[PDB]
C-alpha cells in the first residue's frame, strides 16, 4: 500500500500472508473460518506455499504466529486469466487455524448486499509502499 | 517492502466511473476503489478490501490489479465478492 500507515498489531485478525518455502511474502489473503482462506486466483498458490496467520512484523522472531499448510487449492473455474476476471481462489488448510485475539474471521456479504459508491472502506497488506 | 502490516482507507467507485480510467477492462465481477491519494500495490494482491456493515467488517473486495506504478490518482481494481460469494458457499458446502 502506497501512502498508508502502520496498523495496530492484531487489529486485522483475518489478514494472512502467503509465503513460499523460502519465506518470501508474495500475496495476502483473508480467513473466512478456521479451515479456509480466500485469496486471488492470480496469486498462483500451490500446496508447497504456506499461510501465515497472526503476523504483524515479518522481521520479528518473537511473534506467536501460526504457519499453516495448504491441503488443496480451489481456483474458481470462471477465472479468466486473460482479463483477470473472477479473480478468486479458496485454500483449504490441512491444519486448522486456532482462533484467538489476533486470529479470527472476516464476514462474507450476501449476494444482494449493496455497497454504494463513495463509501469509505479499508484495505490492508504487506505490499510495496513505494514503486 | 514493509516489514509491518499497513492499512489505508479509501472510497468505492462505480464501475461506470471506473471505466473512465480503465475502459472495457472493467467487468461485472470487479469493483474499483481508491484514486484518493493511496493505492494498493504489488504484494497486496489477494488481501482484503473490507467495509463496515451493521457493525461488522465485511469482505467486499479482493486486491486484484491496477496501475503498474501504483499511481495514487488511479483506482485500484478488486474482485467483487458479492458476485463470487455463491461459488464460495457452493465450495465450502461440497468440501
Amino acid at each position: 500500500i502506497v501512502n498508508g500507515e502502520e496498523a495496530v498489531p492484531g487489529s486485522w485478525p483475518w489478514q494472512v500472508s502467503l509465503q513460499d518455502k523460502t519465506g518470501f511474502h508474495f500475496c495476502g489473503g483473508s480467513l473466512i473460518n478456521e479451515n479456509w482462506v480466500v485469496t486471488a486466483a492470480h496469486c498462483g498458490v500451490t500446496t508447497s506455499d504456506v499461510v501465515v496467520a497472526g503476523e504483524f512484523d515479518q522481521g520479528s522472531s518473537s511473534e506467536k504466529i501460526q504457519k499453516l499448510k495448504i491441503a488443496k487449492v480451489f481456483k474458481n473455474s470462471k477465472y479468466n486469466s486473460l482479463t483477470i476476471n473472477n479473480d478468486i481462489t479458496l485454500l483449504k488448510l490441512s491444519t486448522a487455524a486456532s482462533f484467538s485475539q489476533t486470529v479470527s474471521a472476516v464476514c462474507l456479504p450476501s449476494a444482494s448486499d449493496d455497497f454504494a459508491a463513495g463509501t469509505t472502506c479499508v484495505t490492508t497488506g504487506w505490499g510495496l509502499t513505494r514503486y | 517492502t514493509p516489514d509491518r502490516l499497513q492499512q489505508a482507507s479509501l472510497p468505492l467507485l462505480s464501475n461506470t466511473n471506473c471505466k473512465k480510467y480503465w475502459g472495457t477492462k472493467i467487468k461485472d465481477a470487479m469493483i474499483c476503489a481508491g484514486a484518493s491519494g493511496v493505492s494498493s500495490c504489488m504484494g497486496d494482491s489477494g488481501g482484503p478490501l473490507v467495509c463496515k456493515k451493521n457493525g461488522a467488517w465485511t469482505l467486499v473486495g479482493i486486491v486484484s490489479w491496477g496501475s503498474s506504478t501504483c499511481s495514487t490518482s488511479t483506482p485500484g481494481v478488486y474482485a467483487r465478492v458479492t458476485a463470487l460469494v455463491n461459488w464460495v458457499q457452493q465450495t465450502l458446502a461440497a468440501n
Binding site: A40, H42, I84, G127 | K25, S40, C41, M42, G43, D44, S45, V63, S64, W65, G66, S67, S68, C70, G76
Partner: peptide, 4 residues
C-alpha cells in the same frame, strides 16, 4: 497494468 499489472497484477498486484
Amino acid at each position: 497494468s499489472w497484477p498486484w
